[PDB]
């Protein structure tokens, strides 16, 4: 039965590789070498948050570019105020193993989850005056990697074993489950149109899903190790992938290619997070060498180096307005840069 | 500032006080981790102490414990193992009755798992407590079968004590770091409320050694 496979699979992969190889007239550097360099950029530490007592594993920015959420390895989940460094809420978790926090696009819900195979959703605006658990999401078999909001009624999650799911909140039942990977899935990002998103596997592969139907439309390869973070281009036609091979890459949707590889000979550590800046000119990437490098988008030249941490950087993000940059580490501190 | 800003900073100070109290309360509890090979004596080990991760909770002689179990995780181990850096000890269950069962020797798989857990770069400063579960089965199983099927290089008779010593020393041999960590290797089937006593002795010894290395002259 596998005898037909051992030829048809190879024929199909060759017929899908030959065209994309024959549509590779030039590169990104060859065309964008004429643009002027961005010059060295310097960023100082503006505010430092001193609340946690353990490692910090996640961070997310609210829509208003003022509020913040953090989830520490201890049973806590603190909501900060990025302008005055106060605390507005503090949530005690039922399980002490969390690996992702997410903030609603409106400002009324906060979701978390981790090794407990469940995704808890908390409600912030309540008549009583305290955070109360709303729904306990179940149906997964492995650890919970990352979760994101579409609206106040739907959520996309990235399981541990193979699956990524979409379910509504009124009924704790999965609406659509799509599986095409072979290995763990860690990171996912949502396109602005809310109709498409991409997920990064651990078998050196990234796929592009469809929210409405539930099929996989495109696939990309190229890395020699696992992928740990993905962020979309602001436009909505590209995304960057971080790996443990000590390199970042930039893919294109309509091209089905890889454009440029960002890797230096001095760096040998791993990459834990990646996020684009506004207008898609800078690419902030977290590193395991105790630093956070800043790269150029249309060129490989390295911009300034953002180094103010005593442990490895795990999560970072850029606000919607584009002013602030936040980084978290396995130390208790969470820094805000500008 | 306004009145609302002062109220907000008062709320922030209250939250900080509560968090400090919670950290101080939770800072004096022992954390452990059980790792096993397939279906081992873990089920009967957890009995005398009193989805995915399961938490077990008990106290003994004015000391507070907190035990985890991640046997039913079924994922890539090297990827979620970061979170257990702060554990005090690592309990390990090994079956002595699987030296003839094959599924590929079962005891050799247990040895490989012990090697991978012990020489991992994270747990380099943490002790290991080894439980040898089955006793009564070993007595009736040695008399009929030769132990050479599990380790051919052994030379000796078919008594009990030499076989037990050989198994214990071969398990203890794989520890490359002789100085930083120590192994204890207690037997079982004598639960008799004695296993909790052994765990208490081991944890108090490891905590006093950790304190001596941290602040003392060691």
């Amino acid at each position: 039965e596998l005898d037909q496979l051992r030829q048809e699979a190879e024929q199909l992969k060759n017929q899908i590789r030959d065209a994309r190889k024959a549509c590779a007239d030039a590169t990104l550097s060859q065309i964008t070498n004429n643009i002027d360099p961005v010059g060295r950029i310097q960023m100082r530490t503006r505010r430092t948050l001193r609340g946690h007592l353990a490692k910090i594993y996640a961070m997310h920015w609210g829509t208003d570019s003022r509020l913040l959420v953090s989830a520490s390895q201890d049973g806590k989940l603190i909501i900060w105020d990025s302008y005055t460094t106060n605390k507005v809420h503090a949530i005690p978790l039922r399980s002490s193993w969390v690996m992702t926090c997410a903030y609603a696009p409106s400002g009324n819900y906060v979701a978390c989850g981790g090794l407990d195979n469940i995704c808890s959703i908390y409600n912030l605006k309540t008549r009583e005056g305290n955070v109360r658990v709303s729904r306990e999401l179940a149906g997964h078999t492995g650890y919970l990697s990352c979760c994101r909001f579409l609206d106040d009624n739907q959520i996309v999650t990235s399981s541990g074993d193979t699956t990524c799911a979409l379910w509504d909140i009124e009924t704790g039942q999965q609406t659509t489950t799509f599986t095409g990977h072979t290995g763990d899935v860690m990171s996912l990002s949502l396109a602005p149109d809310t109709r498409l998103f991409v997920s990064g596997a651990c078998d050196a592969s990234a796929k592009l899903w469809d929210v409405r139907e539930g099929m996989c439309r495109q696939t990309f390869t190229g890395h020699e190790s696992d992928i740990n973070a993905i962020c979309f281009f602001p436009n909505g036609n590209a995304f960057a992938t971080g790996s443990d091979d000590a390199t970042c890459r930039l893919f294109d949707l309509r091209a089905d290619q890889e454009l440029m590889t960002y890797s230096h000979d001095n760096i040998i550590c791993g990459i834990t997070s990646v996020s684009f800046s506004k207008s898609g000119r800078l690419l902030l990437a977290g590193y395991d060498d105790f630093n956070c490098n800043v790269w150029d988008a249309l060129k490989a030249d390295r911009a300034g180096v953002l180094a103010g941490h005593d442990n490895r950087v795990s999560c970072l993000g850029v606000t919607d307005d584009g002013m602030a940059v936040a980084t978290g580490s396995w130390d208790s501190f969470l820094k805000i840069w500008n | 500032l306004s009145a609302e800003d002062k109220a907000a900073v008062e709320r922030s100070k209250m939250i900080d006080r509560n968090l400090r109290e919670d950290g101080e309360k939770a800072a004096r509890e022992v954390k452990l981790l059980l790792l096993g090979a397939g279906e081992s004596g873990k089920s009967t080990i957890v009995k005398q102490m009193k989805t995915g991760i399961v938490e077990t909770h008990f106290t003994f002689k004015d000391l507070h414990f907190k035990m985890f179990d991640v046997g039913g995780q079924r994922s890539e181990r090297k990827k979620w193992i970061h979170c257990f850096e702060g554990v005090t000890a690592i309990i390990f269950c090994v079956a002595l009755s699987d030296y003839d069962l094959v599924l590929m020797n079962r005891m050799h798989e247990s040895m490989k798992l012990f090697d991978s857990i012990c020489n991992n770069k994270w747990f380099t400063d943490t002790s290991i407590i080894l439980f040898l579960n089955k006793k009564d089965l070993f007595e009736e199983k040695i008399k009929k079968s030769p132990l050479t099927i599990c380790y051919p290089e052994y030379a000796g008779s078919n008594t009990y004590e030499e076989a037990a010593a050989y198994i214990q020393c071969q398990f203890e041999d794989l520890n490359k770091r002789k100085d930083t960590k120590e192994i204890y290797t207690h037997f079982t089937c004598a639960t008799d409320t004695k296993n909790v006593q052994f765990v208490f002795d081991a944890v108090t010894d490891v905590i006093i050694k950790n304190n001596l290395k941290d602040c003392g002259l060691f």
Partner: single-chain antibody, 233 residues
């Protein structure tokens, strides 16, 4: 669901003493701050006392500096207010109030029911209007002025609005300039700036008859207005 009930008060000789009490019912009493608001038989709305979260900051009014004491006990979820020397200007309903303070909070959310006693410099909101005839199906506007400009350096004004129908307790309508509250219809709009503030409604119904008040929250001594009755001929 949320309920505040307060009781205890009769007739007192001019110089006696009595103690009030208010009991909570399931709203996480330990995380909020409470107030006390006074109202003579047919007058406006003064201010009496205050207690904060954790029994920290405790600020009183001007007239009642030396005869009132405010205290709370988190167990049993009750609040008290003692009295020592009472003159003939202490006959009023005392209207226990709730309040929470954070970045997006809504102070003065829930107002209690009230008791009854019969003993037998700062900002001044004018609100010169007293009574205006109204008819259903049209838009009316009420004006308010303040001595000091309320636009702080943070960028947000501090002045609220209230409604009180005849024979019950007040409720919050807009908890700043241009920030509508929950549980109130969306036919209201602040549209204020500087020192001349206003409030317009879309259509007037039979449930909107009552009195509207103003309140400032820059300086801690909270002053009030005088009222604006709608008669609805």
């Amino acid at each position: 669901d949320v309920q505040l009930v307060e009781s205890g008060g009769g007739l007192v000789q001019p110089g006696g003493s009595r103690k009030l009490s208010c009991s909570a019912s399931g709203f996480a009493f330990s995380s909020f701050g409470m107030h006390w608001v006074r109202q003579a038989p047919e007058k406006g709305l003064e201010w009496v006392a205050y207690i904060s979260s954790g029994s920290g900051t405790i600020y009183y009014a001007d007239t009642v500096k030396g005869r009132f004491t405010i205290s709370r006990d988190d167990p049993k979820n009750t609040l008290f207010l003692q009295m020592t020397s009472l003159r003939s200007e202490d006959t009023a309903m005392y209207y226990c109030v709730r309040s929470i303070y954070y970045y997006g909070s809504s102070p003065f959310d829930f107002w209690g029911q009230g008791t009854t006693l019969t003993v037998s410099s700062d900002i001044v909101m004018t609100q010169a209007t007293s009574s205006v005839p109204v008819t259903p199906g049209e838009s009316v506007s009420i004006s308010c002025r303040s001595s000091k400009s309320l636009l702080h350096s943070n960028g947000n004004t501090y002045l609220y609005w209230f409604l009180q129908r005849p024979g019950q307790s007040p409720q919050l309508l807009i908890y700043r300039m241009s920030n509508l509250a929950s549980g109130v219809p969306d036919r209201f709009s602040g549209s204020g700036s500087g020192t001349a503030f206003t409030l317009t409604i879309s259509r007037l119904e039979a449930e909107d008859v009552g009195v509207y008040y103003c309140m400032q929250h820059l300086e801690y001594p909270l002053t009030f207005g005088a009222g604006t009755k709608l008669e609805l001929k």
